[PDB]
Amino acid sequence: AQYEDGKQYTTLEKPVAGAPQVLEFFSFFCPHCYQFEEVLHISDNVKKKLPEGVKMTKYHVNFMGGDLGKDLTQAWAVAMALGVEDKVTVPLFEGVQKTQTIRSASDIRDVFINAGIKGEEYDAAWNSFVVKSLVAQQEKAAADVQLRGVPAMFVNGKYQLNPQGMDTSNMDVFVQQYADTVKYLSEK
């Protein structure tokens, strides 16, 4: 067939019940994740091709960058709780990987302030139990699929994208193949 288990995707031997329809994992420390988000715009191109009624979820992971890595998982929870993902994703990626000006929790906070989130609003969220449960959700989702590397994308807790089985000579074409594959897996 054109889409083959083991080639564009793999099937989890241990399916995860009640998993989000499309679930992407990343880390702000992850160089390929920077490419995915900043250069390739994977999340955005998948979304444009997803059928109606399927929502997209994106979670941060703890297993890169040590203490700051965990701070970033908590900051991403804040991002989700306030609904400001599209305001802080670029400066967080550039702050960690490009300018390397993010070295502490306070530096992370500065990014949100610069993005227009009020200090008190950030701080209240950071310390909130709603954010603690968001952090838990992120950890649980990664745990459910034995996650050990990023970037990663899962469809219906049953299938895992396998971008290594794709030509990368043209970045445009890789992205649309990636996106067309998620749609195919979505319709399975």
PDB file of C-alpha atoms in Angstrom:
ATOM      1  CA  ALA A   1       0.000   0.000   0.000  1.00  0.00           C
ATOM      2  CA  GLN A   2       0.997   3.676  -0.161  1.00  0.00           C
ATOM      3  CA  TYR A   3       0.829   4.090   3.614  1.00  0.00           C
ATOM      4  CA  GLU A   4       2.470   1.164   5.411  1.00  0.00           C
ATOM      5  CA  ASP A   5       2.702   0.313   9.065  1.00  0.00           C
ATOM      6  CA  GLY A   6       6.387   0.410   9.880  1.00  0.00           C
ATOM      7  CA  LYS A   7       7.025   3.045   7.237  1.00  0.00           C
ATOM      8  CA  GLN A   8       5.240   6.407   7.581  1.00  0.00           C
ATOM      9  CA  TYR A   9       3.912   5.382  10.953  1.00  0.00           C
ATOM     10  CA  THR A  10       4.139   2.668  13.552  1.00  0.00           C
ATOM     11  CA  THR A  11       1.341   1.070  15.517  1.00  0.00           C
ATOM     12  CA  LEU A  12       1.636   1.016  19.303  1.00  0.00           C
ATOM     13  CA  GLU A  13       1.602  -2.557  20.614  1.00  0.00           C
ATOM     14  CA  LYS A  14       0.028  -1.057  23.711  1.00  0.00           C
ATOM     15  CA  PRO A  15      -2.815   1.297  22.624  1.00  0.00           C
ATOM     16  CA  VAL A  16      -3.715   4.181  24.929  1.00  0.00           C
ATOM     17  CA  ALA A  17      -7.440   4.510  25.634  1.00  0.00           C
ATOM     18  CA  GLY A  18      -9.046   7.966  25.768  1.00  0.00           C
ATOM     19  CA  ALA A  19      -5.961   9.599  24.255  1.00  0.00           C
ATOM     20  CA  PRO A  20      -6.265  12.956  22.446  1.00  0.00           C
ATOM     21  CA  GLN A  21      -7.068  12.667  18.745  1.00  0.00           C
ATOM     22  CA  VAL A  22      -3.836  14.326  17.602  1.00  0.00           C
ATOM     23  CA  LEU A  23      -1.140  14.626  20.268  1.00  0.00           C
ATOM     24  CA  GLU A  24       2.216  16.298  19.633  1.00  0.00           C
ATOM     25  CA  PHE A  25       5.147  16.291  22.114  1.00  0.00           C
ATOM     26  CA  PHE A  26       8.091  18.709  22.121  1.00  0.00           C
ATOM     27  CA  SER A  27      10.702  20.373  24.227  1.00  0.00           C
ATOM     28  CA  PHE A  28      11.966  23.949  23.909  1.00  0.00           C
ATOM     29  CA  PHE A  29      15.446  22.339  24.229  1.00  0.00           C
ATOM     30  CA  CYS A  30      14.913  20.022  21.274  1.00  0.00           C
ATOM     31  CA  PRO A  31      16.740  21.131  18.109  1.00  0.00           C
ATOM     32  CA  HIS A  32      14.502  19.162  15.717  1.00  0.00           C
ATOM     33  CA  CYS A  33      11.458  20.617  17.550  1.00  0.00           C
ATOM     34  CA  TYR A  34      12.770  24.108  16.790  1.00  0.00           C
ATOM     35  CA  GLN A  35      12.927  23.083  13.139  1.00  0.00           C
ATOM     36  CA  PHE A  36       9.426  21.570  13.281  1.00  0.00           C
ATOM     37  CA  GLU A  37       7.883  24.632  14.760  1.00  0.00           C
ATOM     38  CA  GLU A  38       9.953  27.581  13.578  1.00  0.00           C
ATOM     39  CA  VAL A  39      11.027  26.462  10.072  1.00  0.00           C
ATOM     40  CA  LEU A  40       8.671  23.665   8.961  1.00  0.00           C
ATOM     41  CA  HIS A  41       5.515  24.790  10.831  1.00  0.00           C
ATOM     42  CA  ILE A  42       4.375  21.185  11.242  1.00  0.00           C
ATOM     43  CA  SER A  43       1.662  21.824  13.834  1.00  0.00           C
ATOM     44  CA  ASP A  44       0.090  24.439  11.656  1.00  0.00           C
ATOM     45  CA  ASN A  45       0.161  22.448   8.431  1.00  0.00           C
ATOM     46  CA  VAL A  46      -1.271  19.335  10.096  1.00  0.00           C
ATOM     47  CA  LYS A  47      -4.102  21.456  11.480  1.00  0.00           C
ATOM     48  CA  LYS A  48      -5.032  22.914   8.128  1.00  0.00           C
ATOM     49  CA  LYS A  49      -5.509  19.412   6.762  1.00  0.00           C
ATOM     50  CA  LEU A  50      -7.260  17.779   9.677  1.00  0.00           C
ATOM     51  CA  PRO A  51     -10.914  16.813   9.049  1.00  0.00           C
ATOM     52  CA  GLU A  52     -13.711  18.579  10.909  1.00  0.00           C
ATOM     53  CA  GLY A  53     -14.228  17.603  14.560  1.00  0.00           C
ATOM     54  CA  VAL A  54     -10.639  16.582  15.317  1.00  0.00           C
ATOM     55  CA  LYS A  55      -8.763  18.866  17.724  1.00  0.00           C
ATOM     56  CA  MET A  56      -5.011  19.108  18.227  1.00  0.00           C
ATOM     57  CA  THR A  57      -3.125  18.873  21.521  1.00  0.00           C
ATOM     58  CA  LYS A  58       0.521  19.815  22.111  1.00  0.00           C
ATOM     59  CA  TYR A  59       2.466  18.994  25.268  1.00  0.00           C
ATOM     60  CA  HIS A  60       5.934  19.810  26.604  1.00  0.00           C
ATOM     61  CA  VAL A  61       8.206  17.153  28.099  1.00  0.00           C
ATOM     62  CA  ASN A  62      10.506  16.959  31.098  1.00  0.00           C
ATOM     63  CA  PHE A  63      13.254  14.658  29.914  1.00  0.00           C
ATOM     64  CA  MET A  64      15.437  17.325  28.260  1.00  0.00           C
ATOM     65  CA  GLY A  65      17.184  20.241  29.938  1.00  0.00           C
ATOM     66  CA  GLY A  66      17.005  19.156  33.558  1.00  0.00           C
ATOM     67  CA  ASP A  67      15.619  21.649  36.016  1.00  0.00           C
ATOM     68  CA  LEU A  68      14.901  24.301  33.362  1.00  0.00           C
ATOM     69  CA  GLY A  69      13.212  21.640  31.256  1.00  0.00           C
ATOM     70  CA  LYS A  70      10.698  21.050  34.032  1.00  0.00           C
ATOM     71  CA  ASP A  71      10.205  24.786  34.506  1.00  0.00           C
ATOM     72  CA  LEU A  72       9.355  24.932  30.822  1.00  0.00           C
ATOM     73  CA  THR A  73       6.772  22.159  31.172  1.00  0.00           C
ATOM     74  CA  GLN A  74       5.174  24.230  33.917  1.00  0.00           C
ATOM     75  CA  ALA A  75       5.408  27.423  31.807  1.00  0.00           C
ATOM     76  CA  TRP A  76       3.778  25.611  28.884  1.00  0.00           C
ATOM     77  CA  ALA A  77       0.948  24.646  31.271  1.00  0.00           C
ATOM     78  CA  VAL A  78       0.641  28.378  32.030  1.00  0.00           C
ATOM     79  CA  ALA A  79       0.636  29.035  28.282  1.00  0.00           C
ATOM     80  CA  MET A  80      -2.205  26.563  27.819  1.00  0.00           C
ATOM     81  CA  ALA A  81      -4.177  27.806  30.806  1.00  0.00           C
ATOM     82  CA  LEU A  82      -4.034  31.430  29.645  1.00  0.00           C
ATOM     83  CA  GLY A  83      -4.416  30.499  25.980  1.00  0.00           C
ATOM     84  CA  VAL A  84      -1.284  32.353  24.923  1.00  0.00           C
ATOM     85  CA  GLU A  85       0.609  29.537  23.157  1.00  0.00           C
ATOM     86  CA  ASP A  86       0.780  31.489  19.894  1.00  0.00           C
ATOM     87  CA  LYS A  87       2.357  34.407  21.714  1.00  0.00           C
ATOM     88  CA  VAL A  88       5.100  32.663  23.651  1.00  0.00           C
ATOM     89  CA  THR A  89       6.129  29.703  21.468  1.00  0.00           C
ATOM     90  CA  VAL A  90       8.495  31.682  19.205  1.00  0.00           C
ATOM     91  CA  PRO A  91      10.250  33.720  21.969  1.00  0.00           C
ATOM     92  CA  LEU A  92      10.640  30.629  24.137  1.00  0.00           C
ATOM     93  CA  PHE A  93      12.234  28.632  21.315  1.00  0.00           C
ATOM     94  CA  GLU A  94      14.492  31.559  20.378  1.00  0.00           C
ATOM     95  CA  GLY A  95      15.259  32.309  24.009  1.00  0.00           C
ATOM     96  CA  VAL A  96      16.425  28.760  24.672  1.00  0.00           C
ATOM     97  CA  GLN A  97      18.113  27.920  21.348  1.00  0.00           C
ATOM     98  CA  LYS A  98      18.886  31.095  19.411  1.00  0.00           C
ATOM     99  CA  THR A  99      19.844  33.883  21.834  1.00  0.00           C
ATOM    100  CA  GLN A 100      20.299  31.509  24.793  1.00  0.00           C
ATOM    101  CA  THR A 101      18.966  34.160  27.159  1.00  0.00           C
ATOM    102  CA  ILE A 102      16.680  31.783  29.027  1.00  0.00           C
ATOM    103  CA  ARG A 103      18.628  30.277  31.945  1.00  0.00           C
ATOM    104  CA  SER A 104      16.184  30.537  34.852  1.00  0.00           C
ATOM    105  CA  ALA A 105      12.498  30.446  35.709  1.00  0.00           C
ATOM    106  CA  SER A 106      12.659  34.234  35.936  1.00  0.00           C
ATOM    107  CA  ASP A 107      13.954  34.445  32.339  1.00  0.00           C
ATOM    108  CA  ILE A 108      10.996  32.335  31.270  1.00  0.00           C
ATOM    109  CA  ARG A 109       8.672  34.704  33.100  1.00  0.00           C
ATOM    110  CA  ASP A 110      10.255  37.673  31.266  1.00  0.00           C
ATOM    111  CA  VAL A 111       9.182  36.164  27.948  1.00  0.00           C
ATOM    112  CA  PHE A 112       5.538  36.175  29.050  1.00  0.00           C
ATOM    113  CA  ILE A 113       5.804  39.758  30.393  1.00  0.00           C
ATOM    114  CA  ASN A 114       7.319  40.930  27.105  1.00  0.00           C
ATOM    115  CA  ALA A 115       4.470  39.128  25.350  1.00  0.00           C
ATOM    116  CA  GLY A 116       1.966  41.215  27.331  1.00  0.00           C
ATOM    117  CA  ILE A 117       0.865  38.797  30.024  1.00  0.00           C
ATOM    118  CA  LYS A 118       0.566  40.740  33.293  1.00  0.00           C
ATOM    119  CA  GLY A 119       3.088  39.787  35.961  1.00  0.00           C
ATOM    120  CA  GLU A 120       0.464  39.117  38.565  1.00  0.00           C
ATOM    121  CA  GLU A 121      -1.546  37.121  36.008  1.00  0.00           C
ATOM    122  CA  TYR A 122       1.472  34.988  35.131  1.00  0.00           C
ATOM    123  CA  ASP A 123       2.378  34.464  38.806  1.00  0.00           C
ATOM    124  CA  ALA A 124      -1.176  33.545  39.833  1.00  0.00           C
ATOM    125  CA  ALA A 125      -1.340  31.026  37.011  1.00  0.00           C
ATOM    126  CA  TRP A 126       2.143  29.631  37.714  1.00  0.00           C
ATOM    127  CA  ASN A 127       1.141  28.852  41.287  1.00  0.00           C
ATOM    128  CA  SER A 128      -2.394  27.655  40.535  1.00  0.00           C
ATOM    129  CA  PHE A 129      -3.758  24.140  40.975  1.00  0.00           C
ATOM    130  CA  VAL A 130      -5.346  24.323  37.529  1.00  0.00           C
ATOM    131  CA  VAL A 131      -1.779  24.631  36.216  1.00  0.00           C
ATOM    132  CA  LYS A 132      -0.607  21.750  38.465  1.00  0.00           C
ATOM    133  CA  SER A 133      -3.277  19.521  36.879  1.00  0.00           C
ATOM    134  CA  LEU A 134      -2.191  20.689  33.412  1.00  0.00           C
ATOM    135  CA  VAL A 135       1.391  19.686  34.276  1.00  0.00           C
ATOM    136  CA  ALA A 136       0.062  16.305  35.442  1.00  0.00           C
ATOM    137  CA  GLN A 137      -1.868  15.837  32.186  1.00  0.00           C
ATOM    138  CA  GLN A 138       1.322  16.520  30.212  1.00  0.00           C
ATOM    139  CA  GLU A 139       3.359  14.072  32.255  1.00  0.00           C
ATOM    140  CA  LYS A 140       0.641  11.380  32.112  1.00  0.00           C
ATOM    141  CA  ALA A 141       0.255  11.620  28.318  1.00  0.00           C
ATOM    142  CA  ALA A 142       3.985  11.151  27.768  1.00  0.00           C
ATOM    143  CA  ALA A 143       4.029   8.337  30.295  1.00  0.00           C
ATOM    144  CA  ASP A 144       1.096   6.601  28.526  1.00  0.00           C
ATOM    145  CA  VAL A 145       3.189   6.137  25.361  1.00  0.00           C
ATOM    146  CA  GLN A 146       6.580   5.471  27.039  1.00  0.00           C
ATOM    147  CA  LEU A 147       7.870   8.684  25.445  1.00  0.00           C
ATOM    148  CA  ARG A 148      11.656   8.860  25.119  1.00  0.00           C
ATOM    149  CA  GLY A 149      12.231  11.284  22.268  1.00  0.00           C
ATOM    150  CA  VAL A 150      10.852  14.376  20.652  1.00  0.00           C
ATOM    151  CA  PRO A 151       9.478  15.645  18.364  1.00  0.00           C
ATOM    152  CA  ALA A 152       6.693  13.024  18.366  1.00  0.00           C
ATOM    153  CA  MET A 153       3.115  12.875  17.181  1.00  0.00           C
ATOM    154  CA  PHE A 154       0.439  10.323  17.995  1.00  0.00           C
ATOM    155  CA  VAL A 155      -2.966   9.813  16.439  1.00  0.00           C
ATOM    156  CA  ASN A 156      -5.805   8.380  18.573  1.00  0.00           C
ATOM    157  CA  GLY A 157      -3.373   6.792  20.999  1.00  0.00           C
ATOM    158  CA  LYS A 158      -2.846   4.098  18.405  1.00  0.00           C
ATOM    159  CA  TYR A 159      -0.379   5.385  15.820  1.00  0.00           C
ATOM    160  CA  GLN A 160       2.956   7.196  15.961  1.00  0.00           C
ATOM    161  CA  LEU A 161       4.278   9.297  13.073  1.00  0.00           C
ATOM    162  CA  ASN A 162       7.531   8.061  11.560  1.00  0.00           C
ATOM    163  CA  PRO A 163       9.133  11.021   9.684  1.00  0.00           C
ATOM    164  CA  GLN A 164      12.392   9.083   9.165  1.00  0.00           C
ATOM    165  CA  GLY A 165      10.612   7.249   6.368  1.00  0.00           C
ATOM    166  CA  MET A 166      10.371  10.488   4.308  1.00  0.00           C
ATOM    167  CA  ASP A 167      12.436  12.508   1.803  1.00  0.00           C
ATOM    168  CA  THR A 168      13.678  15.835   3.159  1.00  0.00           C
ATOM    169  CA  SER A 169      15.289  17.310   0.028  1.00  0.00           C
ATOM    170  CA  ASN A 170      12.402  19.753  -0.240  1.00  0.00           C
ATOM    171  CA  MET A 171      11.075  21.089   3.052  1.00  0.00           C
ATOM    172  CA  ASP A 172       7.622  21.988   1.634  1.00  0.00           C
ATOM    173  CA  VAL A 173       7.084  18.456   0.363  1.00  0.00           C
ATOM    174  CA  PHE A 174       8.157  16.795   3.599  1.00  0.00           C
ATOM    175  CA  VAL A 175       5.662  18.919   5.544  1.00  0.00           C
ATOM    176  CA  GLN A 176       2.718  18.122   3.287  1.00  0.00           C
ATOM    177  CA  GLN A 177       3.577  14.426   3.306  1.00  0.00           C
ATOM    178  CA  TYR A 178       3.721  14.603   7.090  1.00  0.00           C
ATOM    179  CA  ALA A 179       0.391  16.418   7.172  1.00  0.00           C
ATOM    180  CA  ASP A 180      -1.297  14.145   4.591  1.00  0.00           C
ATOM    181  CA  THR A 181      -0.156  11.179   6.705  1.00  0.00           C
ATOM    182  CA  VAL A 182      -1.749  12.540   9.896  1.00  0.00           C
ATOM    183  CA  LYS A 183      -5.006  13.038   7.953  1.00  0.00           C
ATOM    184  CA  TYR A 184      -4.874   9.469   6.618  1.00  0.00           C
ATOM    185  CA  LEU A 185      -4.236   8.166  10.129  1.00  0.00           C
ATOM    186  CA  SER A 186      -7.060  10.348  11.418  1.00  0.00           C
ATOM    187  CA  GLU A 187      -9.482   8.768   8.938  1.00  0.00           C
ATOM    188  CA  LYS A 188      -8.439   5.209   9.822  1.00  0.00           C
TER     189      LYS A 188
END
